[PDB]
RNA sequence: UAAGGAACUCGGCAAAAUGACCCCGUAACUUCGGGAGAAGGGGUGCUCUUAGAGCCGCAGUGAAUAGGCCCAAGCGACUGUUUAUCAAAAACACAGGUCUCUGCUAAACCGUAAGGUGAUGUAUAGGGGCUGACGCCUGCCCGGU
RNA sequence: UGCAUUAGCUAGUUGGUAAGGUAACGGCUUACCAAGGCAACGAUGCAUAGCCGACCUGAGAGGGUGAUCGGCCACACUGGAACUGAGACACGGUCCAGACUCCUACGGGAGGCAGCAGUAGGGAAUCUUCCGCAAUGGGCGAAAGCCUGACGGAGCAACGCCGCGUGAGUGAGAAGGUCUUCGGAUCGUAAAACUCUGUUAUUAGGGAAGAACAUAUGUGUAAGUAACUGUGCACAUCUUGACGGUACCUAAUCAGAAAGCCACGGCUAACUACGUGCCAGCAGCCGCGGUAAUACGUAGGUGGCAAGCGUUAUCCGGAAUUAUUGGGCGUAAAGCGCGCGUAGGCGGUUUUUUAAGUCUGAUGUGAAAGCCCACGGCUCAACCGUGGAGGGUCAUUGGAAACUGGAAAACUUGAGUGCAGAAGAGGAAAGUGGAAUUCCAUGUGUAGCGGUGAAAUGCGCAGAGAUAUGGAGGAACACCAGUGGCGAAGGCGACUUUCUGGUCUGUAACUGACGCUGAUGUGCGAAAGCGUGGGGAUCAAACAGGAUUAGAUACCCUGGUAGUCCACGCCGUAAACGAUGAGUGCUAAGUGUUAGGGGGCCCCUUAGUGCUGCAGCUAACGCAUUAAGCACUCCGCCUGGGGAGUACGACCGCAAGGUUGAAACUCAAAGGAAUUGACGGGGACCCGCACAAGCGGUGGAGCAUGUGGUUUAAUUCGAAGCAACGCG
RNA sequence: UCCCGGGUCUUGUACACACCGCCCGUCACACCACGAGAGUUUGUAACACCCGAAGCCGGAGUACCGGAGCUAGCCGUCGAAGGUGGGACAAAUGAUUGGGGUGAAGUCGUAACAAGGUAGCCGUAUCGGAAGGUGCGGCUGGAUCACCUCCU
RNA sequence: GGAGGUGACACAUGAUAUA
RNA sequence: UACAA
């Protein structure tokens, strides 16, 4: 059955991005909402809408493509996994693509990026790399 | 495999094997047991000198049968043109198999113990136990 | 019965040795039952206290009675039977196997017959031949009889 | 640290009470009571091993090692004890037992280098039976001092590291060597010649530091004293060096004493000649050598290093070749034949809470030496010293609360239930039926039937085969029938009844994460096979005969037993295959088909089952919403070929065998996909005196001629299937 | 149609020194390692029993006040070594024996690779000098030619 | 046109490297 | 070609 809803979200984005879809819908959760907003804030996706329903909510994402239909998102990668959880300290926060990408980190001050985690001197669970 | 499978059954590297097994064993006479020591050479006595034919190649390759100091029997190649060896000769044996000769995995050291140096050698003498002329 | 201990002898024949009870402990092989009492070892008297403390002898199941054991091979599976009176066995029997005869007034057997056995049974039964537990198996020849 | 091809271990054992015992707690010991304790998170047993700081390697993650220096432990010929003592169950103590060695005058006595040297032995291999207590440290002493194989030094060894030499400047193509396309080229500014230097070397002259002291002798001061002596502290005087006349410095003389080792086909820097002729030899790999060898041996030249240079052995790297970082499993090695299911691993949404994981500070600790950075002393450098940094999965303590975990409470999407429909060779049992095969009987009826490439064996005139009717019996179910259906897989196909499993569609009553996977385990599992008992038509291992063939233990023919069938047990294997593990989600289309549903034959929609085809993936072939795409979870499996799914052990089995499963040794490949050819007793088309249709010859005779073989003094040499032989 | 040879296209191939190709197994030869094997030898460790040292525990002689104390000795429990016994395990070797690897192609055939001349392979059974044959089930990882479903 | 299902006499041998 | 027979 479903074991990693976050990796399912990152893969839904990867598959939709591969075929250059305009948008995609997925069932919602709090961390998936916060992951999506960071992608919006960092400029990887266009917009996030939340659609309420009886079951668990729906997240609508809008993908971004530049001139000549070049993909803004190049890749997504799940780092921490149910089979093997990955944690890091602020002093060992990984840089993604030499700083040209981002790492999503779940810290005790919420879900933030790696550049901000070093700024706040907090570590936590490395959710995913986006570049 | 999965991480859980690796935790249950970790990786195992292949065990390396030695090309000169007769050199890496000693013998304690008092306890009549075999040791493991990694010697670079071993003394031995020639049981039967002679010749053997190669496996495309064709020649009469000189060799000796040697009982090493650890009571192991080996076939050792005699390099160089002419040798002074016969039965009951005391020889020093080093590693290095000779291709085209099946069952010969060792070399006799020229110029050590009873083996003489190659006569008339002038190039690469230290490989054939020959003193510097003149 | 000194010392020896199978040197005796066709052959340890005969004799010696073992031997009871109680407690430890027990191999190959096996048809899983066995082998097994395998083997090999410990304890036994008497008095006193309530398992200990003592006492005596060379010796305590102090007499008599009471398995010797082990390793390996042939034959026969086994218990049983036999030459009364020189042979007890590897011979006979055996459970098991197979072949064959027999439809019942059966076949087979006794008897001249009547009458009987088979059987007050009926083919999962009865008679005869060969083989002989069990395991794996049982090849070729139908020319002759 | 290995090994599960080691699964059971323990009976003072585990706990209790009491006593004893110890520096001390305690089954530490004993007595009595109870039956506990350990183990798949690997007990126990076997094997191996002193452990760490460190060291080697590596980008790192890791892998490998424990010599030297430091910490800890253990041991002192082997085993058992105790004594003295603060401390030992004591290396150079005792007692006892044992092995061994030595003295004896046979009663008796003696000894323990794993201290430093040294000897013998073993070994490929590892040093002097040296000097001194001057320094540092230790024991004893009031001290002087004594003792100290600790230690400080010297000796031997290129064993390693670092440093410096073996000359420097000028010098146009000498001789000699080697090669030569005999012009020359090269060794080569190299040599000689001219000058210059003395690191080193030899001879001589000087000559440190390392030494601090202690004692003693004076003064001063502090405490104390009634006071002194003494004691503590301070200053001043005194003696002391194994190394050693060493380091170092100064002067003189001389290029004179001081270069070797490996390599030169490619990897890989550097080529020629001669000798050799698959020999001799070389070789890490590819491989080299069989008469023109840059690969063998030598020579000249060159390259790489240099007081070293090569070889061997061993470890890490290259090796992503055990892949956490960082690999795989359709066809290359690799998905268990398939279910059910235990432990374990993993697990949907939200709120509150917690604080084990996670994060973030504080404190302590992670010795010294080492590594790395900085600085200082050694003429430099090695090396030495000093100051930092680093290294923990460490502990204790204060905070944070997103994620994982724990608690509580909600939720309905996952998963189940209910209700309403539908399809099905799903399974088990018992019945009914039609065709055909074989056999049997009867009637007609006569000469073959049968079989093959051709035959023969075989059956038949005693009436076959054919034909018609009837009977017996076993086995199997035409048509329907379809990349159709059902089942986990194996599998399931006439019809009827009975018993029974699962799936699909719709609905949204209900429960409220109840899920996924699944080691061990437990079951099912084609065919053959095995046991017991039945049955026996057809077919048919074995077998027989007949053919074919050089042979034919085959293929073909005529028969034919087990078996094929049933029941009940066993066996547990198949190319048990989609050669593709299960679960979940996401990612163009087109078009068939099976079972449904909704709406207006078509459109939409579920769940199966096929074909084609994007993106993506792939070594390619190909896969492609039924993935071999993109992801997460769990399981199984792989790590070159052979040996070998073998051996040994173990478990299972009546047996056949099955499951688990090595190594020695050997090779440099084995292998996958695709490509160009060739070939096929593959296919299609086509052609040639190729066959067919014809005519005339050769092979037989004599002779001519060429050849072979024999001869010979010579019978010259060349040509050898077509394509040598009236050929040059 | 057939014998020899050649051309085009296609198909299979384990061939490329290209079918005068490749290649399998028995038997014979030489070396090597390994298993089995009537047996023989050695080592470890436990167990049980017997004996049992020094030591542990218990039970005549010589500062205090003839006595106390003490020592010597004697007895039993525990005690290393040793001996006895039967097993477990491990290493060595053993007439003979089995299969394997390598070397060389000696011998017999020709099993596989082409439809390899009977398509091959898997399991199983059985037979045979050998490769192998045959039966039953399975697979396509089978060539050539048919009749149908599908796709283009 | 390309796939998937379905069905359909005899002929022995040729050493090693180097190619 | 060098071999093998
Ligand atoms: K009978
Ligand atoms: K007869
Ligand atoms: K001293
Ligand atoms: K062709
Ligand atoms: Mg007597
Ligand atoms: Mg007597
Ligand atoms: Mg006697
Ligand atoms: Mg006698
Ligand atoms: Mg006699
Ligand atoms: Mg008698
Ligand atoms: Mg008695
Ligand atoms: Mg009898
Ligand atoms: Mg009897
Ligand atoms: Mg009688
Ligand atoms: Mg009698
Ligand atoms: Mg008989
Ligand atoms: Mg007859
Ligand atoms: Mg050790
Ligand atoms: Mg690396
Ligand atoms: Mg004491
Ligand atoms: Mg001492
Ligand atoms: Mg000593
Ligand atoms: Mg010494
Ligand atoms: Mg020696
Ligand atoms: Mg001192
Ligand atoms: Mg002294
Ligand atoms: Mg040397
Ligand atoms: Mg070069
Ligand atoms: Mg050489
Ligand atoms: Mg030459
Ligand atoms: Mg070379
Ligand atoms: Mg050379
Ligand atoms: Mg140097
Ligand atoms: Mg390596
Ligand atoms: Mg490596
Ligand atoms: Mg790989
Ligand atoms: Mg997989
Ligand atoms: Mg294969
Ligand atoms: Mg494979
Ligand atoms: Mg499967
Ligand atoms: Mg299988
Ligand atoms: Mg220095
Ligand atoms: Mg219903
Ligand atoms: Mg249904
Ligand atoms: Mg499951
Ligand atoms: Mg399993
Ligand atoms: Mg069957
Ligand atoms: Mg037949
Ligand atoms: Mg049967
Ligand atoms: Mg059955
Ligand atoms: Mg498989
Ligand atoms: Mg999957
Ligand atoms: Mg999927
Ligand atoms: Mg496709
Ligand atoms: Mg579909
Ligand atoms: Mg003609
Ligand atoms: Mg010629
Ligand atoms: Mg002519
Ligand atoms: Mg063939
Ligand atoms: Mg064939
Ligand atoms: Mg046959
Ligand atoms: Mg199948």
From Swiss-Prot, chain A:
GO terms for cellular component: ribonucleoprotein complex; ribosome. GO terms for biological process: translation. The keyword RNA-binding applies. One of its GO terms (molecular function) is structural constituent of ribosome. It comes from the Bacteria. The keyword Transcription does not apply. Keywords: Ribonucleoprotein, Ribosomal protein, RNA-binding, rRNA-binding. One of the primary rRNA binding proteins, it binds directly to 16S rRNA central domain where it helps coordinate assembly of the platform of the 30S subunit. HAMAP family: Ribosomal_uS8_B. PANTHER family: 40S RIBOSOMAL PROTEIN S15A. Belongs to the universal ribosomal protein uS8 family. Part of the 30S ribosomal subunit. Contacts proteins S5 and S12. This is Small ribosomal subunit protein uS8.
Curated annotation (Swiss-Prot), chain B:
GO terms for cellular component: small ribosomal subunit. One of its GO terms (molecular function) is tRNA binding. Residues 1-54, 116-134 are annotated as: Disordered. InterPro entries: NA-bd_OB-fold, Ribosomal_uS12, Ribosomal_uS12_bac. SUPFAM superfamilies: Nucleic acid-binding proteins. Keywords: Methylation, Ribonucleoprotein, Ribosomal protein, RNA-binding, rRNA-binding, tRNA-binding. CDD domains: Ribosomal_S12. One of its GO terms (biological process) is translation. The keyword Heme does not apply. The modification 3-methylthioaspartic acid is found at residue 100. Belongs to the universal ribosomal protein uS12 family. Part of the 30S ribosomal subunit. Contacts proteins S8 and S17. May interact with IF1 in the 30S initiation complex. With S4 and S5 plays an important role in translational accuracy. HAMAP family: Ribosomal_uS12_B (MF_00403_B). This is Small ribosomal subunit protein uS12. It comes from Staphylococcus aureus (strain USA300).
